[PDB]
Design a protein around this ligand. Structure first.
Ligand SMILES: O=C1Oc2cc(O)ccc2/C1=C/c1ccc(OC(F)F)c(OC2CCCC2)c1
Ligand SMILES: O=C1Oc2cc(O)ccc2/C1=C/c1ccc(OC(F)F)c(OC2CCCC2)c1
Ligand SMILES: [Mg+2]
Ligand SMILES: [Mg+2]
Ligand SMILES: [Zn+2]
Ligand SMILES: [Zn+2]
Lengths: 321, 324
């Protein structure tokens, strides 16, 4: 009811996602995905039975760990809703088919599923089952994909049952390509390629960007979900500060497991010699602002408010030092 | 005694055209164990890396067990053959003193594990049938990721860690090199792999001793990647009686996958239809568009070390062509 009221902001940057998590019984992923699907008419377009959508979303959400401070169902819901907003930027108006829109939203929803709260490097260094399965390459991201797709096979969970086989083939490839690109070790190459696309950009009269081949279109979707993954410092400060508390809690719990094991403590994971505030300013200066600056160019001017909130938040964090 | 004859055959371990099928029978279907053990002793690898002999035998037998005895081509005999072929290629004059003991160990180990637990069907088949493997590996080098995961996992079985006395740096470096090599055996990487190898040949540097000069990891791993890929695609370069037995086996494997496909109403993949296969013409096209372009480029890289191998390949191509 109040939940129904908060969801009216589903198209707005800065949605009250923690409120929605509280008001939904810890089901923000299920309710925000359901709303975005209904909003985008995806159940009818792709003949998804609503009970099958709900069943899948709840199983998916159940496989996000509730005892993981950052990489949980609330972050999944947040990346979903963030991608949903960026898909509707005027400078991308219907650039993407309904299948490409389903792909980016579905990939956003599964992109961190069953995250254990430790980094790929930790999984490699502890000789984990996951790193052994995936040969040290994008270990978490390959696992998120495999779980997200595997859950489609549970009873009444195949939300793609009424897609054609080639639609399913095309959707599967796009989702894999998008989620594998969320690995932060791919950030720099992803950004180089986004910059290249900016300096050779092409525009219609009303403003809609022109992408002709799959290669460029998937690359925009990869950077879009990557931006949505890295969108915490662009949200209203009250939201950003809670994201920061959660990621630092997750880092410190990793550094405690590293200390326990007598492993070398990873950067920013030592709760005894951290500077949360200077780390966020560095995060913004070196990762988040270069990314959102290049994205704002690509969709000029639709991202100016987003970029404005980011620069305000960087100035504030700097002022706490 | 069978052991006297087996040991006689194992004296050929440094020669192209080893009787690997006789060794598989003489050894009690243990070609991979006996050939690996022979090569490790020949290269003094047990001493260099402090490998207990019982640990080496135990891992090798467990690894060999995880090749499928009911798969016609991608079995323990293929793995033994690629090991032994890589072992010969490592000894080529153009590469003398180029690679470290650790890199040699990596190339030989990668060859041994490179197809382990192969089920006898292609990556595309596993993608098309929504297999567990393809689901686990997101349709990308599905088999090759699996071969690596199994090969490394078996090191953790009882008395199986043949790398127990390597330093952490050694293990870390070996692990990455093995992964880089086995992932490059995926045939969908072949065109890019061959394109890069051509570039290296066109810009190659040699030392004052006439041996290939490899400055950096990227060039060193590229050569080891193509070395094991060549060994994997070495059947048409072998004496004809070996080559023909390999062709019989790959065709039985292909036909058996096409049977499964034709059952499922799937379109049979090229060359998997026993009711409409052309074995000889397919081998000629395999050599013309894949094996000879690769081996001609490798021959250029190590010229003239591989001239007899390339000559055998060309004769075998002529022979299969004459049977059309
Ligand atoms: O650190 C990270 O490694 C990753 C790896 C991935 O593959 C994906 C996402 C992340 C990721 C995400 C992340 C999200 C929010 C952060 O701060 C704030 F916005 F909440 C954040 O800050 C860290 C990094 C520097 C200062 C602390 C990090
Ligand atoms: O077909 C294959 O797909 C692969 C995929 C891989 O990733 C690695 C290896 C192979 C591979 C190997 C292979 C090996 C030997 C063959 O012929 C003969 F030498 F035994 C062979 O012939 C086939 C293909 C062309 C006509 C029949 C194929
Ligand atoms: Mg992630
Ligand atoms: Mg293989
Ligand atoms: Zn994420
Ligand atoms: Zn092979």
């Amino acid at each position: 009811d109040v939940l129904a009221k908060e969801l009216e902001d589903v198209n707005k940057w800065g949605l009250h996602v923690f409120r929605i998590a509280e008001l939904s019984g810890n089901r923000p992923l299920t309710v925000i995905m359901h709303t975005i699907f209904q909003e985008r008419d995806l159940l009818k377009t792709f003949k998804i039975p609503v009970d099958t959508l709900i069943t899948y979303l709840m199983t998916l959400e159940d496989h996000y760990h509730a005892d993981v401070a950052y990489h949980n169902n609330i972050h999944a819901a947040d990346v979903v809703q963030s991608t949903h907003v960026l898909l509707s930027t005027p400078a991308l108006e219907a650039v993407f088919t309904d299948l490409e829109i389903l792909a980016a939203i579905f990939a956003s929803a599964i992109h961190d599923v069953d995250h254990p709260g430790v980094s790929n490097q930790f999984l490699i260094n502890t000789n984990s089952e996951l790193a052994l399965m995936y040969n040290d390459s994008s270990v978490l991201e390959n696992h998120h994909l495999a779980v997200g797709f595997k859950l489609l096979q549970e009873e009444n969970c195949d939300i793609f049952q009424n897609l054609t086989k080639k639609q399913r083939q095309s959707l599967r490839k796009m989702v894999i390509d998008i989620v594998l690109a969320t690995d932060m070790s791919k950030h720099m190459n992803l950004l180089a390629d986004l910059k290249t696309m900016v300096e050779t950009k092409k525009v219609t009269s009303s403003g809609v960007l022109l992408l002709d081949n799959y290669s460029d279109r998937i690359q925009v979707l990869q950077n879009m979900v990557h931006c949505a993954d890295l969108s915490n410092p662009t949200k209203p400060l009250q939201l950003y500060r809670q994201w920061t508390d959660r990621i630092m809690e997750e880092f410190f719990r990793q550094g405690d497991r590293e200390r326990e094991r007598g492993m070398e403590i990873s950067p920013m994971c030592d709760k005894h010699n951290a500077s949360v505030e200077k780390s966020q300013v560095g995060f913004i200066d070196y990762i988040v602002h270069p990314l959102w600056e290049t994205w704002a160019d690509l969709v000029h001017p639709d991202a100016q408010d987003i970029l404005d909130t980011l620069e305000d938040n960087r100035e504030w964090y700097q002022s706490t030092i």
